Amino acid sequence: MFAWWGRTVYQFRYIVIGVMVALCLGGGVYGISLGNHVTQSGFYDEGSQSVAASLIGDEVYGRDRTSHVVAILTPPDDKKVTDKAWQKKVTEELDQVVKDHEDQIVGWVGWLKAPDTTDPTVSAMKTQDLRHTFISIPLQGDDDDEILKNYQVVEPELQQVNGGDIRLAGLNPLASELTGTIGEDQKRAEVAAIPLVAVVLFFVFGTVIAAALPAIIGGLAIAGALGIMRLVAEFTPVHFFAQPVVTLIGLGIAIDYGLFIVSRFREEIAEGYDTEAAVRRTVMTSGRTVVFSAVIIVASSVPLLLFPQGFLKSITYAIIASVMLAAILSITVLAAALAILGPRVDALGVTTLLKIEEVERGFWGRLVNVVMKRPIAFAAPILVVMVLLIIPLGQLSLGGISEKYLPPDNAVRQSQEQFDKLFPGFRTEPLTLVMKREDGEPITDAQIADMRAKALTVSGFTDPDNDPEKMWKERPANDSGSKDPSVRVIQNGLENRNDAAKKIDELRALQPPHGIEVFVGGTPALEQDSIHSLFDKLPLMALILIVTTTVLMFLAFGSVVLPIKAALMSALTLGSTMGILTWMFVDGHGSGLMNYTPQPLMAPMIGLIIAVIWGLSTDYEVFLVSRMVEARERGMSTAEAIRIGTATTGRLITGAALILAVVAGAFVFSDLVMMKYLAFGLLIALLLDATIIRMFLVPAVMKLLGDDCWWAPRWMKRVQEKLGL
Ligand SMILES: CCCCCCCCCCCCO[C@@H]1O[C@H](CO)[C@@H](O[C@H]2O[C@H](CO)[C@@H](O)[C@H](O)[C@H]2O)[C@H](O)[C@H]1O
Ligand SMILES: CCCCCCCCCCCCO[C@@H]1O[C@H](CO)[C@@H](O[C@H]2O[C@H](CO)[C@@H](O)[C@H](O)[C@H]2O)[C@H](O)[C@H]1O
Ligand SMILES: CCCCCCCCCCCCO[C@@H]1O[C@H](CO)[C@@H](O[C@H]2O[C@H](CO)[C@@H](O)[C@H](O)[C@H]2O)[C@H](O)[C@H]1O
Ligand SMILES: CCCCCCCCCCCCO[C@@H]1O[C@H](CO)[C@@H](O[C@H]2O[C@H](CO)[C@@H](O)[C@H](O)[C@H]2O)[C@H](O)[C@H]1O
Ligand SMILES: CCCCCCCCCCCCO[C@@H]1O[C@H](CO)[C@@H](O[C@H]2O[C@H](CO)[C@@H](O)[C@H](O)[C@H]2O)[C@H](O)[C@H]1O
Ligand SMILES: CCCCCCCCCCCCO[C@@H]1O[C@H](CO)[C@@H](O[C@H]2O[C@H](CO)[C@@H](O)[C@H](O)[C@H]2O)[C@H](O)[C@H]1O
Ligand SMILES: Cc1cc(C)c2cc(C(=O)NC3CCCCCC3)[nH]c2c1
């Protein structure tokens, strides 16, 4: 199979390069418009009670458009908002923007449209010092994605209102900024990472062409994968976060796959094989390794599909498409490229760009020896410290997206915070009690008061007017609502947002009046229901993830102790990185240096980070411990096999780690705190696996079990033998 392709890829090397490059470039052109076909939904559970509550509320009362855009207007030259000349000028400008963009803007409302109003709420849309007043600009659209697109059409003209002295906040200015970080992080991966990957690869290989080929494969992999995701978007919604994942996870593995087979090819040429034989032998050995690595990653990714969140489903499609294409590219276009180049892959050295030994082996061999001489002296301190690194995970907190996902100095975030300071109480995050009478008869005022009294028995809800009778007010109704009298909604915000899980259960435990059912919704309910469904499915997801990888490791090791030992090592790294991440992003250690706000984490990201870290650690352990098994099966001491595996894989694993560190390190500078969390989790797990696990914990522990590492019942080794994966 790999034998046949190794000969075939040589024979049709020109056809292979031409077809594969055209497909990837054609996919890249198709994938340019992906950013215009992604969605922001997917963080919630579509089957939850809170989602049903939101659908009923919107259907009966109408979609609330008053939070789409809020604009703070400050008169120039220290004038007050009561300046009649200033009022007329800004009013005419706003009317012109609405008239020019009626397809996008419903209109604008606020104190400026009725300065002589007596309504206390409308009169509160201006500050006491008369220096600031704000307006609401509802937008057209039937869903949040369409509404955001409408906002981005009119934003440039809106920002010019009042001589530019207008501050835009609310849902869509922030949603535009949050989704805008995707483009900023992506250019880093393609303008800052790839050049740094090139200098890292040049330090590994020493020649220009050998260093350039893995970078080119990564670029082709990104181009094709974005095109595949664009195709996927035609059939199912694709979350916008799936796009940066392609450029982070897909790019890193694509370059690492390229590094592995280019390294093997140069070693085959150096051993004396001609180009034809070298290509075949590289596919037979390194091509099998990358293909098996791909199935490990795919096996580590598909368990996320158990979760209902569309966000997680979109990520796995991106991951699977990225790794399958990269594996295919590494053994089709890369192998064909080396077949054409031959030894000329090393032709160009430092001088080209310039114009435009025994000690090392012994030391690393000695380090393994020192570790094995006193293994408990190494394993015991490492085991203790890694367990202590799990302790901060006990302080795990979970929430949802806000303006705090942006750095504290972000302009749009600061406009939002200025609005909440100048105009307190206008922003709310209420829990809703969606009352429905199954009889179809109208809900009475007494029944609404019965429900309010029940909700007033739950502590922790805000009382701004100090009167409980003014709490749990009815949701405002819009003209787009059906106003079905059999459905009525009352709502109230929480005093402390972290109490949402407890308070929602209390609300859901209240007995409603006789013939009515109650659905509890609101944004805090949407998050808590999504949190609950994720951790409900997590035990099954973790079970499938562990067993699928362990059997794959058993197929790769031919042992029963080795897959179990490596699963324990994977669990230790997974726990340690999560504690460190909680220590950094919840507790805030490192927040000032990296300019992010400590806050609760996003729950679907822990599921993603579990799958990614488990896959990465399994991938590195499989490659290393194999070379030990391969040395043991041919006849060697257990101590020598550990030394041979470490020496023979040291250059490749270290180089792969350096590559991924550059790629992930580029994304730790993202303005989105969620991306920082994912990129750092990758960096920590990589540093632990490449240094603490590979060089200290693996060689030490494996010496403790001695020759029992290779133990495996023969009726199980026969199944491994009959397949030979
Ligand atoms: C993160 C913060 C973003 C969320 C905050 C956004 C919510 C704040 C927007 C307030 C919108 C509702 O506030 C106000 O309600 C009143 C009461 O019906 C509406 O009703 C008003 O209409 C117009 C004013 O334009 C006049 O005829 C009159 O003063 C009144 O009837 C106003 O048009 C609306 O401005
Ligand atoms: C690998 C990622 C998972 C790491 C999990 C982090 C757990 C941190 C525990 C903090 C201590 C709080 O202790 C709590 O214990 C209960 C069971 O008693 C578990 O969780 C329980 O409480 C939560 C809190 O509302 C409820 O949704 C529910 O009743 C149940 O899930 C969690 O463990 C933790 O919520
Ligand atoms: C591959 C191995 C991985 C296997 C991992 C298995 C982990 C299983 C853990 C189940 C218990 C965690 O359960 C989860 O606990 C957290 C606390 O952190 C609760 O979290 C709750 O309290 C926290 C802290 O007050 C709030 O910030 C949060 O909004 C609220 O939901 C979750 O509601 C509950 O669902
Ligand atoms: C990636 C996309 C994520 C972008 C999200 C970033 C967060 C942006 C900040 C939120 C700003 C809007 O803040 C918004 O305030 C309004 C008005 O108080 C709340 O609106 C709430 O009260 C109003 C008026 O009583 C009800 O008609 C409505 O049904 C209810 O939801 C919204 O629930 C909240 O979302
Ligand atoms: C036969 C006796 C007389 C017939 C009754 C006619 C009404 C008499 C009661 C008027 C005062 C009731 O007192 C006040 O009622 C209003 C309107 O219902 C309630 O108002 C509350 O419920 C109503 C719906 O019922 C919501 O639309 C509103 O947003 C919410 O605040 C107040 O919470 C209550 O304090
Ligand atoms: C800088 C931080 C970046 C983020 C984290 C990256 C983690 C990478 C750390 C790698 C640690 C050093 O890891 C060590 O690398 C050396 C040199 O490559 C390998 O050594 C390998 O190459 C050397 C020559 O260079 C040979 O003599 C040796 O026989 C061979 O094994 C070791 O087998 C490995 O144990
Ligand atoms: C889930 C996941 C995520 C990432 C970023 C990576 C990176 C690798 C990797 O670098 N693997 C290499 C070493 C294993 C042997 C074959 C050569 C490739 N695996 C990953 C898995």
From Swiss-Prot:
Effect of Y257C: Growth defect in both liquid and solid media; confers resistance to SQ109 and AU1235 with 2-fold and 4-fold increased resistance, respectively; disrupted membrane potential; increased cell wall hydrophobicity; more sensitive to ampicillin and the hydrophobic antibiotics, rifampicin and erythromycin, but no change in sensitivity to chloramphenicol or kanamycin, compared to wild-type
Sorted UniProt keywords: Cell inner membrane, Cell membrane, Cell wall biogenesis/degradation, Lipid transport, Membrane, Transmembrane, Transmembrane helix, Transport
Keyword match Ribonucleoprotein: no
Segments passing through the bilayer: 15-35, 197-217, 218-238, 241-261, 291-311, 318-338, 376-396, 542-562, 566-586, 605-625, 653-673, 678-698
GO molecular function: cardiolipin binding; diacylglycerol binding; phosphatidylethanolamine binding; phosphatidylethanolamine transfer activity; phosphatidylglycerol binding; phosphatidylinositol binding; trehalose transmembrane transporter activity
Location(s) in or outside the cell: Cell inner membrane; Cell septum; Cell tip
Species per Swiss-Prot/TrEMBL record: Mycolicibacterium smegmatis (strain ATCC 700084 / mc(2)155) (Mycobacterium smegmatis)
Basic and acidic residues: bias regions: 467-486
Membrane topology: Multi-pass membrane protein
Keyword flag DNA repair: no
Protein's gene: mmpL3
Note: Binds antitubercular compounds N-(4,4-dimethylcyclohexyl)-4,6-difluoro-1H-indole-2-carboxamide (NITD-349) and 1-((2,3-dihydrobenzo[b][1,4]dioxin-6-yl) methyl)-6',7'-dihydrospiro[piperidine-4,4'-thieno[3,2-c]pyran] (SPIRO) with Kd values of 0.05 uM and 0.8 uM, respectively.
Mutagenesis / variant outcome for changing I319T: Binds to SQ109, AU1235, ICA38 and rimonabant with a dissociation constant (Kd) values similar to wild-type
The name this protein goes by in its record: Trehalose monomycolate exporter MmpL3
Residues noted as binding a 1,2-diacylglycero-3-phosphoethanolamine in the record, renumbered to the chain: Q40, S41, G42, F43, Y44
Applications: This protein is a target of small molecules which can be validated by developed assays that measure the topology of trehalose monomycolate (TMM) in the inner membrane of mycobacterial spheroplasts after which they may be developed to future antituberculosis drugs. Designing improved inhibitors against this protein could be achieved by avoiding direct contacts with the identified residues that can mutate to confer drug resistance.
Quaternary organization: Monomer. Interacts with TtfA (via N-terminus); active trehalose monomycolate (TMM) biosynthesis is not required for the complex formation. Interacts with MSMEG_5308.
GO biological process terms on file: cell wall biogenesis; cell wall organization; mycolate cell wall layer assembly; mycolic acid biosynthetic process; phospholipid transport; regulation of membrane potential; response to antibiotic; response to xenobiotic stimulus
Effect on the protein of changing V662G: Binds to ICA38 with a dissociation constant (Kd) value similar to wild-type
